[PDB]
Design a binder for this molecule. Sequence first.
Ligand SMILES: NC(=[NH2+])NCCC[C@H](N)C(=O)O
Ligand SMILES: O=C(O)CCC(=O)C(=O)O
Ligand SMILES: [Fe+3]
Length: 333
Amino acid sequence: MTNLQTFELPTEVTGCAADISLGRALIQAWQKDGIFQIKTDSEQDRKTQEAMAASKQFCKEPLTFKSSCVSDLTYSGYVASGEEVTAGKPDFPEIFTVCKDLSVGDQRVKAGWPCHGPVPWPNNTYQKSMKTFMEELGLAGERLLKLTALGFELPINTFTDLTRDGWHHMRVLRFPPQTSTLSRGIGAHTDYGLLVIAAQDDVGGLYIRPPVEGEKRNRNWLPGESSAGMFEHDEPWTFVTPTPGVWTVFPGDILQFMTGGQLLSTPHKVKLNTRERFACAYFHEPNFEASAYPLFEPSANERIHYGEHFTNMFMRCYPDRITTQRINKENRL
Ligand SMILES: NC(=[NH2+])NCCC[C@H](N)C(=O)O
Ligand SMILES: O=C(O)CCC(=O)C(=O)O
Ligand SMILES: [Fe+3]
C-alpha cells in the first residue's frame, strides 16, 4: 500500500459498539495491508522519544562496556552488530533486549527456568526509561488484544486471558549506515508472540509484506517451516514510511496460529540507510507457561507452548551466546 491506515485507540476497551467497529476495522487493515498505525498521545510520544534518546546515549558507550551487559540466565542485554543471525546470516543492528526483569530471588529463577533472570542494565536511568516505555506499550497491547477479540466476535478477554504476567519484551535497536556492498539490516522474518508494536526515528528502513492472495505462508512455530528469509527478494514489500506521532502494529506467530491463518504473522525486514537508524520493537506475548490453542477449529488438539517457542527462537538467534550455552549445558530446554 502507499498509505497505511491510522487509528485512535480508546483508553479503556469495554465492548461498546464503537469498540466492536474499531476492532473489526483493525482486523480488516491487518488482512489487507499486514499492518496499521495507531496515534500516540503526548505521554506515549514522550516516552518513545525518551527511550530513543537513552538508546543513542548507550550506543555512545565504549564497546567493551556494552559487551559486559550480558547474562547467562536471560537473553536480556547487549547484542553486537553482526552477532544475531536470521536464516543463518548475520543481522547488523546493535541491540539491547529487555525481557522480564526477574531478581535472582524470584522463584522461577531459583528453579532454573530457561530464559528467566535479571536484566543486565547499563544504569538505572536507562532502566527507568525502558520500563516506563514498556508499561505504556503494554497498556496499548492489552487494548489491541481486546479489540481483536471483539472484531472476531469472540469473548473480550480471549487473548488477554493468556497475557497475565505475559512474557512481554523489547528490542532497542540501532542500525549502522550501509556501505556500497552491504545494506542488509535484518533479514526477512516473522516475530513470535501475539502482537508487535514498533517505533522508529525519521531515517527509514522497515519493510513489511502484506497478505498475498494465493501465497502459502510457512508456520514459523513448526520445525521445518521457519519464516526466516522467506520472500526476501520478491515483491510485494511495503515501505513503512517514518510518520510522526504513531506506532505500528502487526501480528506475530501466535495470532496466526490461534486464528488459523485468518491473521498472518507479518513478514518484515530492515534495510540499512545512508544514516544510522534507531528503532524499538515491542512484543506483547502470552505468559511463558501459556498454551495457545486454535480458536476456530473446534476439536483441535494442537497447542503452542509459548515459552517453548520463545526459547527455541532465541537459541536460534544466538547459538553461541552464553545464555544458549548454559541452557545446553544444564539441559534447561
Ligand atoms: N529475536 C527476534 N525477534 N529477532 C528478530 C529477527 C529474526 C530472528 N533472528 C529469527 O531468526 O527468527
Ligand atoms: O527496525 C525495526 O523497525 C524492526 C526490527 C525488528 O523487526 C525486530 O527487531 O524484530
Ligand atoms: Fe521483527
